[PDB]
C-alpha cells in the first residue's frame, strides 16, 4: 500500500496509486491496482492495513452498486463520500476498526464539476483540490501548493502528477514500483497505460 | 495518540450588547501535517449556533447528529429550538456516551428569540455545562484564548467593537499554537441579522 | 358456555372447571394417606397389583424430599413425580442459601405456589394429583395435603384417592379416641389398617402395601421406608382387623 | 371429543385424550416381548415390513453396554427417547464413572415423557418401550408408556395382540424367572411367549429380532441367520 | 472543590465554592455545585462535574416520579439509598462525591456519599480537594445546638478556608438552608469575596484594526 | 362468546372475567371487617374449620406482609397466598430500594396495578381475591386500603368484605352517623377489637366462640395476629357487659 | 408458560369497525361525566367524585392528577386503566423529554406520548384497548394554555371546551351556549360548576366535586426560593372549601 | 478497623472502633461499624466501607424477606447469607465481616467471615487491621461464660490496645449487647479507655 | 392454549385477497376525503375534517395534513393514531437518509419504506394492519413534483391527481374531467376545492371543516416552500374561488 494521490483539475479528477505490495522483506507484487469503481463516474483509491483495505473497498463497492440498481440512478460523489465517511466513523469505535484510508474522485454530472474527497480511517472527510494519504503528502502537498492552478487541463494535471511521482521516487526510502493513474471525468473512468 | 490534539483547531464565543459573537480557525491537520485550510468548525440550527473543536470525525458526526435532532424537534414542536434548550440537548447527548465519549469541546452561541437575551455556553467532552456571561473558549489554543479573553474582554460591547475584540483574541491565541490557524471565521449575531467575516491571518 | 375448555378461565360461578376436572383424575387414583403423630408423621399408599408380573417391593411410590420430608400422591403418577422434582429443587435452593433444611410449612407453600401457578394460564394444565406430605422440622411434626387448585392445609390425618371417604372416616375415629396423641409405631399399624379398610373400594385387583415415616425418636427426624419385620408386623395387625 | 384438541386439556371425567390417542399408536405397533431371570434379561420383537420388497423395521436399540430397549409405535419417537437414554447413560459414565441404574433410566424417561403432556404446543410421545439391563442389583425389565408411567416387571409385552404373550408369561412366571446361567433357554421362553401373539404368520429368519443382556453378557442384538437357531 | 454540610436546631445547611477546573486552568469561576434533588432535598457535589450533575438529575427525576406515585413528600434516605446503589454499581467510575441534605416528614438529615457508594452520617461534613481546610474550621468551631445563623456562618467559614487555602477551590460561596416547616432558601453567591479589580486599561480596539478578506450575510430564516 | 373467556371488552363495555373473579371472592363464605382506633387498626375475619382432621392453627386468611402491614384476604386460599407472597416481596424490595418501610396505601396501589394488568393483558387471569391492607402509617396514622380483581383501590374509615358484607357495612355506616367521627374513639386496641367483634355480632346475628374468629391488630411499628386465648379474653369482656 | 398471545386482539370487522375500540368507547359512555373549559388566562378540568361506599374516603381517590407542574388530567371510564396511564404519562414526560431537554414537555407533546401508549394497546399482541377517555389541560411558554381530549383509539383533539362520559351530549350543548373567547378563568370555573350540576344527581358540594385549574404560577406551592426563573406550578387542585365558596354565588 | 464479637453467659457483645480512613486522612472519626441486619442479629464491618455497607444492606433485605415468610432466622442462617455474597463475589469485594446474634434456643453465637468468604463459628472473633496486635492479649484473657460486665471489660481493654497500636483504628469504642433482655448500645470515649 | 383466540390477521381468502387489508380499506372509505393535485409549478393538498363541532379548536388543530420534512408532506385518511405512528417513522427515516448521504431523501424512497412497513403487517407478525391511506406530496431534484398514495396493503402508485377516503369514485371522475397537464397551482387549488364541494356529505363547504396545503417553488429562486394554510387563509381562498 502506502502511496495514493489525487488531483482535481478543471474537468477531471486524477488518482495515482502505487503498484507494490510488500510483506516482510519481499515485494510480492509490482502491478497492484489499489482502486475500485463505485459507480460509472466515481472511483475510490485506498491504502492501509493488509486485508482490511480490499475488504472495505469491495464492501463499499457492493453497497453503492446495490443502491444504483434499486433506484436506477447514480449517487453523487458527495453522497457516496458521506456514506463512506459514516461507515468509517462507525468502524472506529467497533471491536476491530477498519484501518483504511481512502481518496474518492468523482465527476458530478448534475453540476458538471469534478470532486476529490480525502477520508482517513477515523472518518475524517475533507474536499480538496489535491490530496494524499500516508507519508506521500509530506513531499507532494508543498509541491502542489507551488505548481497547482485551479483551471488546469487533464494533461497539465498528469504532468503535475509526474512531478510528484518523480519527487517521491527521489526521496522516499521504499521502492513503491511506480503508479497506476486513472482519470475520472464526464465520460466516466479510464486508465492511463503508460506512466 | 491524544485524540483531542490530532487535528487541531479552536473556537471562542463572546457576548456583547444585544449581540453575540462566535469565531473559529479553519485548520485541519494530521499532527504536524496541515491538510485542509477550509475546515469550518461552526454550524447553525435555525438561529442557534454551535462550534465544535477536537477530533474532526466527531466534529462532523456531532454536527450531523444535532442537525438530525433539531430537525425532528422543529417538526414536532412546530418552532425552532432555543439556545438554552439546545445547550441541554448537547449535554444529554454527550453524557449518553459517558464511557466512550466524543472527543470534542463544543460551544453554543445565540440570541433567545422570545426574551432577546444573548446566550453562550461551553461543554467538556462528557457534557458538563459551563455557562458564562462573558466568554467561552475551546480547542488546542484554549490556554491562549483564556489569556486573551480575560484581558481583552469588557461587557456591553457594540457588535462592531465585539467583532474587533473576538477577532483579536482568536488571532493572537492561534499564532501561539502550532495546530491552530490557517484561516479564521467570525460570526456576529444580532436578533435578526447575522454577519460572517473571514479574517486575514498568517498562514504558518 | 365452553368455559371448561381452557385452564384459568372463570366460569360465571367463579370456578375454574379445568381444576375440577383434574380433581376427577385424583378421585380415579389409588388411595394414599398421612397420619400425624406425637413426634412425627406416617405415610401409606395402596399399590394395585395389576399382574403377577410386577416385581413386588420394586415399584416404589412414596418419595423423599431432602433428607427429612416424605411425599405421597394419588392421581397421575408422572404429575406427582414432576411436583416432587420441583420440591427437591425448592428445598435445595432453600438449604443452599439459608443452610438449615427447609421447614415443612415453608416447603408446603413452595409446592402450593407452584401448583397454583398452573391455574393462572391457558398454556398449561393443572396438576392431576393430590399430594400428602410432611415431616419433622425444628418446630416438630407437620402433615399437609395439597390439591390441584394449589389449596393446602395442615392436617391431623389426611387421605385422597378412590378410598378417601372410608379412610377419612377411619381417621376421624383415631382423632376422637386419641386426643393426647398417637405414637409413631402405633400410627404405622393404623396406617396399614386404614389402607386395608380403604382397599374395599378397589377390590377387583389385590394390592401391595407401602409405608414410610419421620419420627424424632424412631427415625431421628429423617424419612425412612418401613420394611422387613416392622412392615410385616403392621400387615399382620391389619389382616387381624378386617377379620 | 371437545377435549381432545391438545394435551393441555382435561376431559370432564379427568382424562387426557391426546395421551390416550398416543397410547393407541402403540396398539397398532408390531408385538414385542420382554422377560428376565436373575442372571439375564431378554427382548424378543416381531419386526414388521411394508411389503415383500421392503426391509423389516428394526425394533431394538442398544443404549449402553449394559442397557437397551425394544419399541412399539412411532419409531422416530423411540429414536428420540433412546438417544436421550444413550446420553443419560453416557453422562453417568463420564461424570461419575458409574453405570446408570435401570431404575433411574426409568425415572428419567418418565419425567421426559411427562413434560410433553402438560405444555401447550407439544405432543405426547407415540411409542412404548421395553427396557432391559443388568446393573449393580442384577437383571431388570422395564415397561415405558408415553403417559409417563414406567413399571418394573419380571416379564411383559406390548403392541398388537400383546395379550397372548402377557397371559403366557403370567402362567410361565415360576418357570422362566429361574432360568439362571442359561441364555438360550431364556430366549426360547421369550420366543415361545411372542408366538402366543402371532396370527396367519409365523416367525421367520428375517422376521424375528432378539436381544439379551446379563451378568457376563454385553447387551447384544441378533437378527437374520443368527436367530435361525430359535425357530 | 470545597463543599460542606452543617446541622442546626431546626434543620440543615450546605455550602460550596464555585470554582471549576481543567488541570491548573479555571474553566468556570461561578459554577453551581448545589443541586436540587427535590424542593426540600439539596445536594452539594464534588468530583467529576458532569457526573455530579447527571447522577443528581437522574435521582432527582426518579424521586419526583416516586413522590407522585406515593403521594408523599420525598425523604432524604430515599435519595441517599438511590444515589449510593447507583454509584456502588459503577464501582467509582462515576466520580461523584456528594453531601446529601434536606428536610422531610421524618425530620432533618445530613449525609455524605463517596463515589464508590459508601455513606456517612454526621452533624458536620466536608468533601472535595478543600475538605481538609474546611474540616479544620469545622473541628475548631462546631458545637452541638447551633442556631440557623451560627450554622450558616460556620458553613461559609468552612468554604472560605477552602477558597483561600486550596488551589482546587475559589471564587464565591453558595449556601442552601433547609429548615423544618419552611421553604428551602437557596442563597446563590451568598458571598462574593473575589471580585476582580478594575483593569488598568481598556483594550477596546480602533475599528478597522482587524484585516478582513470577505463578508457575507448568513441566512437563518426559512 | 369468547369475549367472556378472556379479558377483552364485551359489546356493552364489560369484562366478564373480572366480574366472575369477583364472584370467586365469596367462594370461602367468610366475612371480614376492618376498623380504625386512635392508635390502631383492627381487622377481624370469621374462621371456619369444617373438617375435624384439619390442624386449625394452619387455617388462616390473615397475613403479616411486613413488620407494619397486615393483609386479610377474601377469596380462595391459593390465590390468597399468591397475593401475600408477592406483597411481601414488594414491601421488602421497596424498603431496600427507597430506605423506608412501604406504606399501606402504596403497597395497596402497587397490588392494584398488578391486578389491573391482569384485566388488560390476556395471558394472565385475575386473582379471585379482595385484599384488605391495614397498618398504622407513620404519616397517615391508622389506615385501611382495599384491592379487588378490577384493579380498584381506595382508603376507608372502616370496611367489610364477604357474602354478608352489606349488612356489616350499613351497621358500621349507622354507627358513624351517630358518633360523628372517622374512627373508634378508644385508647386501647383491646377495646377496638371488642367494638369490631360486637358490631360483627349485631350485623350477622351470630355468637362467636374463640375458634370462630381470627383477629389482626396493627399498632405503631408492629402488626400482629391474636391467639385463640387472646380472643377468648376479648369475648369474655364483651359478655360481662 | 409465558405470554403466547403475540397476535392482535383488536381487528377490523367486515364493516371496517375496530370492535374493541368501539366497545371501549362504550365503557367511556357509561363512565361518570368529566369536562374541561379553556379560558383566556387558564384552563379548568372537573368531574364528580362518585363514591362506591360512604365508608370510603373519597379524598384518597384522586380523579384529577398532576402530570407535570403545568399539566393535569381527568377522565371518564375505567378508573384503574386511568391510574396506570397517569403513572406511565408522568414517567414518559421525564424519560422522553425532561431527561433530554432539561425542561418539561409542552402539552401537545405529552398528549402525543399518552396517545401513542393508547394506540399501542389497540394493535400490540395480547392486550385490549384502554377503557378511558382523558381530558388533559396544560400550559407551556410557546403555545399558552391548551385542552386536549384523548380517546381509546389513541386519537386526540384540541378543544375550547368539552365533556365526556355519562352526560356529555347535554353538557357539550350547555357549553356551546356559554363559551366565548373572552372568558376569564373565574368565569370558566363558574360555567364548569353549572355544567356539572346537570349531570350530578345526589349531593353537589366541594366533597363530591373534584376540580383543578391550570392558571397563574404559584410560588407558594414551589417548596423553595432563590431561583428567579423557577416560579412554581401552574397546576392547582381547588380545595373542598374553595369550591363551596363559589357554589354560594352560583 | 478494629472489631470483635464475644459470646458470654447471657448472650453476645459486639464491639468496634469508629475510624474510617482514606490513606492517612480520617474521613470519619465517629463511624458506626456495628450494623443491624435483624432485631438481634448484628454484624461488625471491616474492609471497604462501600462493600461492607452494600453487603449489609442486601443481607438486611434478605432477612426481612425471610422473616415475612418463615419467621425469625437463626444466626447461622444470617451468617450463611453473608457468606454466599462474600464467597460468590470474592474477586470484587474487600469485606471482613463478623456476624453475631442471639437466639433463645442457641443463646449467643459468633461467625466470622474473612476475605475468601469462608465461614468460621467461634466463641469469640477479632478482625480488622487492629486485630493483629491483640491476638496475644485476647487468647490469654478470654474465658467462656463470662458475665456482661466482664465481657464489656474484655472488649474495652482489647480494643483499647488495638486502637493504641493501630493508626487505622481510633475514636470511640462502640458496643452492642445482645441478650434475652433486648438490645443495648454502649459507647466509651478516649479519656476513659486510653488510660486503661 | 391461545390458538383459540387468534383471528389470523395475515391470511388469504379462498379468492386470494387479504381479509384484514380489505376490511381496513372499508374503514378508510368512511374517512374525511383527501385530495392531491400536482401541477407543473407545484402541488395541492386539500382534505375534509370529520364532522366537526363548533367548540373544536380549529387553528391549533392537525388531523389531516402533516409535515414529513421540508420538501414532503402527507394527507391522511383513516385512523389518525395509526397514521401518527407511521408519520414519526417516516420523519425519522428521512433524517437517517439526510445524515447518511447529506442529501434530502428522494420522495419515492421515503414512500417505498413506509409502504414496505405496511406490507410487513400483512405478511407476518399476526398483528392488524394500519388503517391508513396516505397521499404523499413532495419535491426532489430528480423527478420534481410528485404525488403518491399508499394504502394498508403496502401498495403504492404515483398520480397527477388522486383522492382517498370517502367518495373517491365521485371525486376521481370529477378530477379526470377537469384536470389537464399544463395546469398551474392556482388552478389546481380551485379544482381541489370544487371537487370537495361537490363530493362532501355536508350541506356546504366552510373554512372550519378543511385543511389545506401547497408545495410551491414560490420562495426565492430554485427552492421549495411548504404552506400549511391557517384557518383565515382557507376562509380567503374559499371566497376567492366563489364557494362562499
Ligand atoms: Mg498558528
Ligand atoms: Mg507552520
Ligand atoms: Mg387476562
Ligand atoms: Mg468494590
Ligand atoms: Mg489509634
Amino acid at each position: 500500500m502506502d502511496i495514493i494521490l489525487g488531483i482535481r483539475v478543471q474537468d477531471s479528477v486524477i488518482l495515482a496509486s502505487s503498484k507494490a505490495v510488500t510483506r516482510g522483506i519481499s515485494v510480492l507484487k509490482d502491478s497492484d491496482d489499489k482502486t475500485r469503481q463505485l459507480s460509472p463516474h466515481t472511483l475510490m483509491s485506498f491504502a492501509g492495513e493488509a486485508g482490511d483495505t480490499v475488504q472495505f473497498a469491495e464492501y463499499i463497492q457492493a453497497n453503492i452498486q446495490l443502491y444504483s440498481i434499486r433506484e436506477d440512478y447514480e449517487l453523487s460523489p458527495q453522497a457516496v463520500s458521506s456514506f463512506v465517511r459514516q461507515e468509517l466513523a462507525k468502524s472506529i469505535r467497533s471491536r476491530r476498526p477498519y484501518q483504511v484510508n481512502v481518496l474518492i474522485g468523482g465527476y458530478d454530472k448534475k453540476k458538471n464539476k469534478p470532486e476529490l474527497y480525502q477520508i482517513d480511517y477515523l472518518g475524517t472527510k475533507v474536499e480538496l483540490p489535491y490530496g494524499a494519504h500516508g507519508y506521500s503528502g509530506f513531499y507532494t502537498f508543498s509541491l502542489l501548493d507551488h505548481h497547482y492552478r485551479p483551471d488546469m487541463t487533464t494533461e497539465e494535471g498528469l504532468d503535475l502528477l509526474k512531478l510528484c511521482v518523480q519527487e517521491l521516487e527521489k526521496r522516499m526510502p521504499m521502492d513503491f514500483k511506480g503508479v497506476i493513474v486513472k482519470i475520472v471525468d464526464k465520460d466516466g473512468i479510464r486508465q492511463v497505460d503508460d506512466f | 495518540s491524544d485524540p483531542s490534539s490530532i487535528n487541531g483547531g479552536i473556537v471562542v464565543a463572546m457576548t456583547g450588547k444585544d449581540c453575540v459573537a462566535i469565531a473559529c480557525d479553519l485548520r485541519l491537520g494530521s499532527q504536524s501535517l496541515g491538510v485542509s485550510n477550509k475546515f469550518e468548525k461552526i454550524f447553525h440550527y435555525g438561529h442557534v449556533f454551535l462550534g465544535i473543536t477536537g477530533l474532526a470525525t466527531d466534529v462532523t458526526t456531532l454536527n450531523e447528529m444535532f442537525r438530525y435532532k433539531t430537525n425532528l424537534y422543529k417538526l414536532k414542536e412546530e418552532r425552532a429550538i432555543e439556545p438554552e434548550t439546545f445547550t441541554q440537548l448537547v449535554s444529554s447527548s454527550l453524557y449518553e456516551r459517558r464511557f466512550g465519549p466524543y472527543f470534542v469541546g463544543p460551544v453554543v452561541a445565540g440570541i433567545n428569540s422570545k426574551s432577546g437575551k444573548p446566550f453562550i455556553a461551553g461543554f467538556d467532552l462528557i457534557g458538563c455545562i459551563d455557562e458564562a456571561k462573558d466568554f467561552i473558549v475551546s480547542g488546542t489554543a484554549s490556554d491562549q484564548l483564556f489569556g486573551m479573553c480575560e484581558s481583552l474582554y469588557e461587557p456591553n460591547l457594540e457588535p462592531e467593537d465585539l467583532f474587533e475584540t473576538i477577532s483579536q483574541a482568536l488571532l493572537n491565541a492561534a499564532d501561539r499554537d502550532a495546530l491552530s490557524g490557517w484561516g479564521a471565521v467570525v460570526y456576529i449575531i444580532k436578533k435578526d441579522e447575522v454577519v460572517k467575516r473571514y479574517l486575514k491571518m498568517r498562514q504558518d | 358456555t365452553g368455559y371448561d375448555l381452557s385452564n384459568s378461565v372463570f366460569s360465571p360461578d367463579g370456578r375454574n372447571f379445568q381444576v375440577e376436572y383434574a380433581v376427577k383424575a385424583v378421585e380415579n387414583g389409588t388411595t394414599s394417606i398421612g397420619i400425624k403423630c406425637n413426634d412425627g408423621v406416617v405415610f401409606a399408599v395402596e399399590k394395585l397389583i395389576t399382574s403377577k408380573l410386577l416385581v413386588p417391593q420394586k415399584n416404589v411410590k412414596i418419595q423423599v424430599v431432602d433428607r427429612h420430608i416424605g411425599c405421597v400422591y394419588s392421581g397421575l403418577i408422572p404429575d406427582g413425580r414432576h411436583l416432587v422434582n420441583r420440591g427437591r429443587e425448592e428445598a435445595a435452593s432453600f438449604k443452599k442459601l439459608y443452610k438449615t433444611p427447609i421447614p415443612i410449612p415453608a416447603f408446603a407453600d413452595r409446592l402450593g405456589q407452584y401448583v397454583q401457578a398452573h391455574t393462572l394460564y391457558n398454556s398449561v394444565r393443572p396438576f392431576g394429583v393430590s399430594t400428602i406430605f410432611g415431616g419433622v422440622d425444628k418446630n416438630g411434626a407437620h402433615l399437609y395435603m395439597l390439591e390441584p387448585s394449589g389449596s393446602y392445609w395442615g392436617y391431623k390425618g389426611a387421605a385422597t384417592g378412590k378410598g378417601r371417604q372410608s379412610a377419612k372416616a377411619e381417621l376421624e375415629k383415631l382423632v376422637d379416641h386419641h386426643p393426647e396423641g398417637l405414637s409413631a409405631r402405633e400410627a404405622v399399624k393404623q396406617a396399614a389398617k386404614i389402607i386395608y379398610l380403604a382397599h374395599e373400594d378397589n377390590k377387583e385387583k389385590d394390592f401391595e402395601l407401602e409405608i414410610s415415616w419421620c419420627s424424632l425418636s424412631e427415625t431421628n427426624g429423617l424419612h425412612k421406608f418401613v420394611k422387613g419385620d416392622l412392615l410385616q408386623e403392621a400387615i399382620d395387625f391389619a389382616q387381624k382387623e378386617i377379620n | 371429543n371437545n377435549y381432545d384438541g391438545d394435551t393441555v386439556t382435561f376431559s370432564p371425567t379427568g382424562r387426557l385424550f391426546q395421551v390416550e390417542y398416543a397410547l393407541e399408536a402403540i396398539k397398532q405397533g408390531s408385538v414385542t416381548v420382554g422377560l428376565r431371570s436373575n442372571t439375564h434379561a431378554v427382548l424378543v420383537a416381531l419386526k414388521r415390513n411394508a411389503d415383500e420388497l421392503s426391509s423389516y423395521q428394526k425394533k431394538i436399540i442398544k443404549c449402553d453396554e449394559h442397557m437397551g430397549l425394544s419399541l412399539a409405535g412411532l419409531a422416530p419417537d423411540a429414536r428420540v427417547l433412546s438417544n436421550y437414554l444413550r446420553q443419560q447413560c453416557n453422562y453417568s459414565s463420564l461424570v461419575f464413572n458409574r453405570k446408570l441404574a435401570v431404575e433411574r433410566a426409568g425415572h428419567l424417561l418418565c419425567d421426559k415423557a411427562q413434560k410433553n403432556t402438560q405444555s401447550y404446543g407439544g405432543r405426547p410421545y407415540g411409542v412404548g418401550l421395553l427396557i432391559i439391563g443388568y446393573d449393580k442389583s442384577g437383571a431388570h425389565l422395564l415397561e415405558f408408556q408415553p403417559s409417563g408411567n414406567v413399571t418394573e416387571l419380571y416379564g411383559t409385552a406390548i403392541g398388537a395382540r400383546s395379550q397372548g404373550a402377557k397371559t403366557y408369561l403370567e402362567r410361565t412366571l415360576d418357570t422362566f424367572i429361574k432360568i439362571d446361567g442359561n441364555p438360550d433357554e431364556l430366549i426360547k421362553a421369550g420366543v415361545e411367549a411372542i408366538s402366543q401373539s402371532l396370527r396367519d404368520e409365523s416367525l421367520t429368519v428375517d422376521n424375528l429380532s432378539i436381544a439379551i443382556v446379563g451378568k457376563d453378557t454385553p447387551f447384544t442384538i441378533y437378527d437374520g441367520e443368527a436367530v435361525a437357531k430359535y425357530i | 472543590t470545597t463543599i460542606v454540610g452543617v446541622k442546626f436546631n431546626n434543620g440543615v445547611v450546605i455550602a460550596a465554592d464555585t470554582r471549576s477546573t481543567q488541570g491548573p486552568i479555571v474553566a468556570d469561576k461561578n459554577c453551581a455545585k448545589l443541586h436540587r434533588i427535590s424542593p426540600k432535598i439539596w445536594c452539594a457535589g464534588a468530583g467529576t462535574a458532569a457526573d455530579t450533575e447527571a447522577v443528581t438529575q437522574l435521582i432527582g427525576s426518579n424521586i419526583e416520579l416516586h413522590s407522585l406515585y406515593t403521594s408523599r413528600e420525598p425523604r432524604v434516605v430515599s435519595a441517599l439509598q438511590m444515589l449510593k446503589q447507583h454509584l456502588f454499581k459503577y464501582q467509582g467510575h462515576i466520580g461523584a462525591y456528594l453531601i446529601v441534605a434536606g428536610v422531610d416528614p421524618t425530620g432533618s438529615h445530613l449525609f455524605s456519599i463517596h463515589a464508590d457508594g459508601s455513606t456517612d452520617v454526621g452533624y458536620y461534613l466536608s468533601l472535595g480537594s478543600g475538605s481538609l481546610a474546611a474540616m479544620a474550621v469545622l473541628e475548631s468551631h462546631w458545637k452541638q445546638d447551633l442556631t440557623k445563623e451560627e450554622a450558616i456562618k460556620l458553613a461559609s467559614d468552612a468554604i472560605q478556608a477552602g477558597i483561600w487555602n486550596d488551589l482546587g477551590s475559589g471564587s464565591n460561596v453558595d449556601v442552601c438552608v433547609m429548615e423544618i416547616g419552611k421553604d428551602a432558601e437557596y442563597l446563590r453567591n451568598y458571598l462574593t469575596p473575589n471580585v476582580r479589580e478594575e483593569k488598568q486599561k481598556s483594550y477596546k480596539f480602533p475599528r478597522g484594526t482587524t484585516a478582513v478578506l470577505k463578508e457575507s450575510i448568513v441566512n437563518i430564516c426559512d | 362468546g369468547y369475549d367472556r373467556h378472556i379479558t377483552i371488552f364485551s359489546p356493552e363495555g364489560r369484562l366478564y372475567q373480572v366480574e366472575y373473579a369477583f364472584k370467586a371472592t365469596n367462594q370461602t363464605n367468610i366475612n371480614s371487617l376492618a376498623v380504625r382506633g386512635k392508635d390502631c387498626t383492627v381487622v377481624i375475619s370469621q374462621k371456619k374449620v369444617p373438617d375435624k382432621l384439619l390442624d386449625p392453627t394452619t387455617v388462616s386468611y390473615i397475613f403479616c406482609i411486613s413488620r407494619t402491614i397486615g393483609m386479610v384476604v377474601n377469596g380462595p386460599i391459593p390465590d390468597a397466598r399468591n397475593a401475600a407472597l408477592r406483597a411481601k416481596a414488594e414491601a421488602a424490595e421497596f424498603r431496600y430500594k427507597y430506605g423506608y418501610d412501604m406504606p399501606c396505601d402504596v403497597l395497596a396501589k402497587r397490588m392494584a396495578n398488578l391486578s389491573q394488568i391482569y384485566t388488560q393483558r390476556a395471558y394472565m387471569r385475575p386473582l379471585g381475591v379482595i385484599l384488605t391492607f391495614v397498618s398504622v402509617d407513620e404519616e397517615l396514622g391508622p389506615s385501611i386500603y382495599k384491592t379487588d380483581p378490577a384493579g380498584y383501590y381506595v382508603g376507608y374509615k372502616a370496611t367489610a368484605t364477604g357474602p354478608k358484607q352489606q349488612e356489616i357495612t350499613t351497621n358500621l355506616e349507622n354507627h358513624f352517623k351517630k358518633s360523628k367521627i372517622d374512627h373508634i374513639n378508644e385508647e386501647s386496641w383491646e377495646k377496638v377489637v371488642e367494638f369490631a367483634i360486637t358490631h360483627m355480632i349485631d350485623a350477622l346475628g351470630t355468637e362467636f366462640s374463640k375458634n370462630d374468629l381470627e383477629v389482626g391488630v396493627a399498632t405503631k411499628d408492629k402488626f400482629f395476629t391474636l391467639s385463640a386465648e387472646n380472643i377468648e379474653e376479648r369475648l369474655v369482656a364483651i359478655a360481662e357487659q | 408458560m409465558t405470554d403466547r398471545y403475540s397476535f392482535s386482539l383488536t381487528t377490523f370487522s367486515p364493516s371496517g369497525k375496530l370492535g374493541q375500540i368501539d366497545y371501549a368507547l362504550t365503557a367511556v359512555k357509561q363512565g361518570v361525566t368529566s369536562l374541561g373549559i379553556k379560558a383566556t388566562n387558564g384552563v379548568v378540568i372537573a368531574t364528580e367524585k362518585k363514591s362506591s361506599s360512604p365508608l370510603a374516603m373519597s379524598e384518597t381517590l384522586s380523579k384529577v392528577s398532576l402530570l407535570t407542574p403545568d399539566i393535569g388530567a381527568v377522565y371518564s371510564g375505567m378508573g384503574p386503566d386511568y391510574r396506570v396511564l397517569v403513572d406511565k404519562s408522568r414517567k414518559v414526560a421525564h424519560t422522553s423529554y425532561k431527561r433530554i431537554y432539561g425542561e418539561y414537555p409542552p402539552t401537545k407533546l405529552l398528549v402525543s406520548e399518552v396517545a401513542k401508549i393508547m394506540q399501542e394497546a389497540t394493535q400490540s399482541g395480547g392486550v385490549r384497548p384502554f377503557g378511558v377517555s382523558l381530558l388533559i389541560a396544560g400550559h407551556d411558554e410557546f403555545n399558552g394554555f391548551s385542552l386536549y381530549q384523548v380517546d381509546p383509539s389513541g386519537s386526540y383533539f384540541p378543544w375550547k371546551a368539552t365533556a365526556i362520559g355519562k352526560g356529555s351530549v347535554a353538557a357539550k350543548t350547555f357549553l356551546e351556549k356559554r363559551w366565548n373567547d373572552e372568558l376569564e378563568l373565574e368565569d370558566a370555573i363558574h360555567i364548569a360548576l353549572l355544567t356539572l350540576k346537570e349531570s350530578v344527581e345526589g349531593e353537589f358540594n366541594g366533597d363530591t366535586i373534584e376540580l383543578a385549574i391550570i392558571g397563574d404560577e404559584n410560588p407558594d406551592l414551589l417548596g423553595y426560593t432563590g431561583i428567579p426563573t423557577d416560579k412554581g406550578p401552574r397546576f392547582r387542585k381547588l380545595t373542598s372549601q374553595e369550591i363551596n365558596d363559589r357554589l354560594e354565588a352560583l | 478497623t478494629s472489631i470483635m464479637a464475644v459470646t458470654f453467659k447471657d448472650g453476645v457483645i459486639l464491639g468496634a472502633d469508629s475510624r474510617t480512613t482514606t490513606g492517612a486522612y480520617i474521613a470519619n472519626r465517629v463511624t458506626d461499624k456495628l450494623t443491624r441486619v435483624h432485631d438481634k442479629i448484628w454484624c461488625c464491618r471491616s474492609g471497604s466501607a462501600a462493600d461492607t455497607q452494600a453487603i449489609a444492606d442486601i443481607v438486611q433485605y434478605h432477612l426481612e424477606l425471610y422473616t415475612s415468610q418463615y419467621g425469625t432466622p437463626s444466626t447461622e442462617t444470617a451468617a450463611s447469607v453473608f457468606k454466599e455474597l462474600c464467597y460468590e463475589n470474592k474477586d470484587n469485594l474487600t469485606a471482613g465481616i463478623i456476624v453475631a446474634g442471639y437466639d433463645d434456643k442457641n443463646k449467643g453465637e459468633v461467625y466470622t467471615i474473612p476475605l475468601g468468604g469462608s465461614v468460621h463459628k467461634l466463641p469469640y472473633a477479632i478482625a480488622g487491621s487492629g486485630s493483629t496486635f491483640i491476638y496475644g492479649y485476647c487468647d490469654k484473657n478470654f474465658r467462656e461464660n463470662m458475665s456482661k460486665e466482664e465481657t464489656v471489660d474484655f472488649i474495652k481493654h482489647s480494643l483499647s490496645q488495638a486502637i493504641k497500636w493501630d493508626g487505622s483504628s481510633g475514636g470511640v469504642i462502640r458496643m452492642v449487647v445482645l441478650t434475652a433482655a433486648g438490645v443495648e448500645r454502649l459507647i466509651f470515649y478516649p479519656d476513659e479507655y486510653e488510660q486503661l | 392454549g391461545s390458538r383459540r383466540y387468534d383471528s389470523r390477521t395475515t391470511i388469504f381468502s379462498p379468492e386470494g385477497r387479504l381479509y384484514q387489508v380489505e376490511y381496513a380499506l372499508e374503514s378508510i372509505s368512511h374517512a374525511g376525503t383527501a385530495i392531491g393535485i400536482m401541477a407543473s409549478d407545484g402541488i395541492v393538498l386539500a382534505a375534509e375534517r370529520k364532522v366537526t363541532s363548533t367548540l373544536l379548536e380549529q387553528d391549533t388543530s392537525t388531523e389531516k395534513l402533516y409535515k414529513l420534512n421540508d420538501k414532503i408532506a402527507v394527507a391522511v385518511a383513516g385512523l389518525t393514531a395509526d397514521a401518527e405512528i407511521l408519520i414519526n417513522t417516516a420523519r425519522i427515516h428521512a433524517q437517517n437518509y439526510l445524515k447518511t448521504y447529506n442529501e434530502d431523501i428522494p420522495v419515492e424512497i421515503l414512500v417505498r419504506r413506509l409502504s414496505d412497513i405496511k406490507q410487513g403487517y400483512t405478511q407476518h407478525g399476526g398483528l392488524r394492519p394500519f388503517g391508513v391511506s396516505f397521499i404523499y406530496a413532495g419535491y426532489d431534484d430528480r423527478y420534481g413534483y410528485q404525488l403518491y398514495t399508499s394504502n394498508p396493503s403496502g401498495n403504492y402508485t404515483g398520480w397527477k391527481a388522486i383522492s382517498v377516503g370517502a367518495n373517491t369514485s365521485a371525486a376521481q371522475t370529477l378530477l379526470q374531467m377537469d384536470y389537464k397537464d399544463d395546469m398551474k397551482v392556482d388552478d389546481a387549488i380551485e379544482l381541489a376545492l370544487k371537487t370537495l364541494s361537490k363530493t362532501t356529505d355536508s350541506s356546504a363547504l366552510t373554512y372550519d371543516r378543511l385543511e389545506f396545503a401547497t408545495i410551491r417553488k414560490g420562495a426565492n429562486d430554485g427552492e421549495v416552500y411548504q404552506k400549511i394554510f391557517k384557518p383565515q387563509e382557507i376562509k380567503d381562498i374559499l371566497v376567492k374561488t366563489g364557494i362562499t
Side-chain angles (χ1 to χ4, degrees), chain C residues 219-238:
Chain C
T219 62
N220 229 119
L222 304 184
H223 181 272
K224 306 186 208 279
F225 292 88
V226 173
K227 320 154 282 170
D229 294 345
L230 196 61
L231 181 62
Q232 192 63 72
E233 178 190 311
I235 290 168
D236 290 343
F237 175 100

Side-chain angles (χ1 to χ4, degrees), chain C residues 1-3 8-14 109 113 116 119-121 149 151-157 172 175-176, chain F residues 4-5 17 20-21 23-24 52-55 58-61 77-79 81-82 85 123-128:
Chain C
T1 51
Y3 295 99
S8 84
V9 176
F10 286 114
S11 70
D13 327 68
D109 200 57
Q113 301 289 0
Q116 190 276 159
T119 73
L120 286 174
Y121 316 96
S149 61
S151 177
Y152 70 76
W153 309 105
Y155 284 80
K156 282 157 184 163
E172 282 183 49
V175 171
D176 289 320
Chain F
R4 314 208 155 204
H5 290 202
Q17 277 299 296
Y20 302 164
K23 264 180 263 174
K52 220 189 295 166
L53 299 178
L54 288 161
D55 178 356
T58 71
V59 175
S60 175
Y61 289 85
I77 196 68
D79 282 11
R81 285 161 174 164
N82 172 122
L85 176 59
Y123 84 112
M124 293 247 48
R125 76 169 169 79
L127 300 170

Side-chain angles (χ1 to χ4, degrees), chain I residues 103-121:
Chain I
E103 274 176 9
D104 289 329
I105 187 167
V107 180
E108 205 206 340
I109 296 183
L110 180 155
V111 172
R112 194 200 295 121
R113 203 146 51 209
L114 254 192
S115 307
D116 277 340
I117 287 166
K118 284 184 198 181
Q119 186 281 156
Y121 279 69

Side-chain angles (χ1 to χ4, degrees), chain I residues 119-130:
Chain I
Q119 186 281 156
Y121 279 69
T122 81
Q123 189 163 213
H124 51 85
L127 306 187
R128 75 169 183 76
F130 294 91

